[PDB]
């Protein structure tokens, strides 16, 4: 009889995983403070990793990789990419980014202005985006002044001015990929992705109205007037998207986009493996990751950010959550296909 | 990767590698000991007082 | 040299104490005449804990036999090992106590108590470093209950910093001699709450159920009940009588078992308990499953009705110490809802190489569980069923007691029940 | 030459002390009768091994050690054991009844009545020293004597020997080989009162030693003898610089200079490799890079924690056996390119390396196999704060209910000393966090 605790009640993903575990009749839930557990569905912030793996006779496992915040933080990611030789500053799939601390607090202010002034003189497109409350502008004076008005670290990266626009509609979008890394640091990519599309036509002559520029599911469902017009919930799945790429562009999702996505996932996760691997550790870790990509009109894929506690699409909750139990939990705590994942082999 | 202060002798050697540059007095202790000895005495007296009743 | 002084009082106390010395004397290779004839040095390593060494290599139990009637102690002196006890350590009167707590505590017992303390003082003066005392007695009678707790009160007055330990037989209507047993038990329990560090609660109904249902004894006798107590007393004292690090002495045992001074009443248990299919080998998992099973417990309290504050387990015999840790950790990790979560690692396990007589291996269980409140609830309800009509009180007011003393003992036990209740939530 | 005096307190301290001095004797060629055929100066000398051994006119080499226990059963083993001849009776001090795993009982009740006797026996050893460096104090956290009496002894030692260094070897409590529920209380009580009196403390977590014995030595159920012989190898590697010719950590003061830049953060992490089973057919001898690389594996640390998520303030490499500086630097380079070694910005990123050519000595009939080279890494990592967090958590669980507190108040301790000690640990955890996290 395996035992687990739940320390993040807001997690929709692991609320289902906990629902499935109990359904097997072989897992038992304990109070969130009972140390005698096999599996911890831990909190998001300040997870006490130092208390794991010190219970005699219990193989303990947790759904978070200590140190993965280096990849799932805006500022941390930019630093990781610029400082890690495995990724290099010349990394071609990540937008030119800079970490900017507000003046009320190293900092890449002057380095950003140098590249900014270079684009301005070269007649090139010089539209940047600041985030950490988002601002899209083509004037460096507005981007910096907006960050000074705040009090947290921000990042300024190049705004993909030539995104791939779906038709009909002429609308932006982004791609979410769920990736599961198990205790053995196998990188599993969920076969099912989701495109969070904008229901408003993309407009390059007005970054003030950010409804057609930001593809967030919450912004399209609150400030957009065409929500749910083209696809249910501004969510197009891979089957539809692949068929589109064939009818319009005469190519496949696998060839034009998915190869780059798998390459980016491997590069990011293999880079930090020596720092977060639990191979020789007194406890074991696994973690679900949410990768967000951008596709430009050249069919080039760009990495936007990595989410450490992602949510799943309503239609894909059952399949993925069950897949989490199979490869992540039962692999360490077996019970008494055609896998839904895609193993990205690599050298450990 | 620099090696400095190499000291060699018959039974070994030592050196240094640099990869990158950068109370209560005796009186007060007796008081604490006697203060705790006093709290024990008071507790035992209350116990004996209780047993005398 | 951490000597323990043993005291047995009243009929029940002397008959159970006699069997206790019978069992452990056999384990240490001591024959009825006090001569050693074992074959393992582990028998004498800690022998002086319970025995004095006389001339001629004679080992004399450090025990004091107390009663207000001669009868039972004449039987002990004529019993199997009756000749092994120091003759001067028989202290007895002639009046008896008529199952009357007041007679044992205030009148008949008061006249005899000083002479018992003289023998206790004598045994202590010859102890290199006295650990403390252990008393065997019942609570439903008059001598063991009333004079027994009077002895404890006066021993704690003369040895205030020594550990006081008792094996206390709790009365049950199903195995009862008189209707006044709840009166005598309620008066004693308050004494024990105040003046003992550890009390092993033994319920006669539990001993009866075990003999009848588990051991398949059609008509259990007091003798059969005392067989269980003997085996249990031998198990819980193995930590003291043989070399070991856990629960080595009485004070360390209390320090790990008693998180609150008044909650020091334990549920003991023993395994195996087999009827006569008695030669079958018992695996470690089976030993552990049964040892925690309510049917193997002798306080007649369901552990599933409370939570364990602390637990001490003693495994005896050549067995897989690794396999013991696995099953112990398995029981805790399979029922962690019955263990308080605010005392980390509150389940301790000790091993002993020498098994009991006639067994390849066994396990003795010592639990400090809030379920023990059920035992004091039963006694309290029986007390109140009679006290509300002042039934049978004249036996006690005739000895100079007042009704007020009963009302206070009643409230004292209900406070104890309430104290257990706050820690069960 | 400057003498060092070793003090062993409680069962853990005494049994570990017995295993260390057994190893010391085998390392220096000292026989159980105290004789040392290789010492050509009879009845005296100022050699490196004389920091730990005095000499009589008869040629006996006597440890500069005191054993203290509030109960005699453990120290009686020493009085009748193999090396009974080494010590004279003044060095072995035993009371009648122990502290019952009760810090207050060891510190106040029993400690008050035997402390002056212990200081008098230490003073006798000090009077034989022409230039005493300080003291090495061995004790457990969980025991009533190791916790309670040790802290009292340290307070007095700071009073009688103000300018003398004091190092600790402390045994961190692990339930797998523990039977006392109150050891978190004792651990935190003795850390609070000892913190200002200890210049450098090497914590050994029994949990770690236990698993190294099961994993590397293939011992299904390790005993204290197994644990202690492994611990004495690590202790030996740490004290070798004081007992042999050398230039690194030549006196107790250098331990603080090289390992403790901030006084309260004086708990270095020890990592040791290789630990090879003697029952093995015959193991492939590991290289300098392989044993060095193992110093950054959690599996061979004396305290289970993850240095990848802390910051280093200092790092010492102590090699024994066939090792030349060339190989050490080569391995260090290869490790910086693969490992996550983050130093605090106000400390240089480097390693102090000591090499003793004599390979580790193994006790005949022990569990460890003879190895051609071994290393012990001493690093001051903020990651060791995980052990304070674990410990302070268990403390909070029991103290919220005042469980077992009456045992301490009953021995004369005030309840407010609990919260006072806990607040000091909370401040200690804060110190580590300010130094390691961003
Ligand atoms: N590594 C190791 N740990 C030990 C040894 N002996 C005891 N311990 C640990 O020390 C703790 C118990 O404290 P002890 O040293 O035995 O107690 P004490 O110092 O003698 O103090 P008292 O309570 O008076 O007995 C537990 O965590 C034990 O696991 C030993 O020989 N080696
Ligand atoms: N450099 C860039 N070029 C073009 N679009 C960008 C961009 N950076 C961000 N975006 C837009 O912003 C949206 C994602 O913003 P971001 O992910 O940084 O905020 P967020 O983290 O709060 C949303 P989530 O974490 O759920 O993916 C995408 O829809 C994308 O269209
Ligand atoms: N287990 C057991 N219980 C007994 C025995 N004799 C009496 N009792 C119980 O003890 C109580 C009577 O006390 P008893 O010892 O006979 O009176 P005392 O001589 O005045 O102490 C009743 O609850 C009896 O059931 C015995 O031999 N074994
Ligand atoms: C509980 C109690 O005291 N019962 C009495 C004991 N002694 C006695 C003597 C003579 C006649 C009756 C009795 C009954
Ligand atoms: Ca009379
Ligand atoms: Ca000499
Ligand atoms: Ca000092
Ligand atoms: Mg985000
Ligand atoms: Mg009777
Ligand atoms: Mg001890």
XYZ file of C-alpha atoms in Angstrom, chain C residues 1-2 46 128-130 161-163 197 245-247 249 251-252 254-261 309-310 321-322 325 341-349 423, chain D residues 11 71-73 96-102 105 175 178-184 210 214 220-221 224 393-395 397-399 401-407 411:
78
model
C 24.919 -2.489 38.665
C 21.429 -0.999 38.221
C 22.639 -8.462 33.882
C 25.218 -0.359 44.318
C 22.998 2.020 42.326
C 19.246 1.497 42.692
C 14.061 10.513 42.630
C 13.779 6.777 41.899
C 11.537 5.311 39.205
C 6.232 6.702 36.390
C 20.858 -0.190 24.290
C 17.155 0.676 23.918
C 15.095 1.046 27.102
C 17.084 1.181 32.372
C 14.428 6.076 33.607
C 15.421 5.935 29.930
C 10.119 6.338 30.887
C 11.839 9.222 29.099
C 10.970 7.687 25.726
C 7.481 6.417 26.609
C 5.941 9.204 28.713
C 5.562 12.573 26.931
C 3.232 13.850 29.687
C 3.584 12.942 33.370
C 1.826 8.352 21.583
C 4.822 5.994 21.779
C 17.028 -8.095 12.343
C 16.841 -6.591 8.852
C 12.953 -3.434 10.631
C 2.383 12.729 13.912
C 3.842 15.251 16.394
C 6.282 12.780 17.973
C 8.727 11.777 15.207
C 9.971 8.181 15.237
C 7.816 7.278 18.238
C 8.063 3.516 17.503
C 11.238 1.900 18.849
C 12.316 -1.709 18.307
C -4.457 14.288 22.709
C 28.817 6.367 24.911
C 27.766 5.510 33.685
C 30.605 2.973 33.787
C 29.570 0.145 31.445
C 27.187 5.741 38.629
C 24.009 6.575 36.669
C 23.639 8.171 33.250
C 21.652 11.210 32.093
C 18.768 9.060 30.772
C 18.867 10.802 27.374
C 17.957 14.003 29.255
C 20.117 15.805 33.622
C 16.429 6.934 13.954
C 18.537 5.492 17.732
C 16.096 4.568 20.476
C 15.529 7.971 22.143
C 12.579 10.067 20.963
C 13.874 13.276 22.580
C 17.180 13.455 20.698
C 15.982 16.463 18.612
C 24.776 3.580 8.184
C 25.202 -1.092 3.852
C 22.903 -5.700 5.982
C 22.623 -4.442 9.585
C 28.343 0.503 16.234
C 11.427 20.659 12.206
C 11.248 17.602 14.476
C 11.860 19.946 17.408
C 6.548 19.138 16.154
C 7.126 17.960 19.723
C 7.559 21.354 21.382
C 2.656 20.047 22.313
C 5.303 20.417 25.061
C 5.864 16.672 24.694
C 8.510 15.377 27.141
C 9.279 18.922 28.357
C 8.392 18.022 31.955
C 11.396 15.671 32.055
C 15.840 18.392 36.363
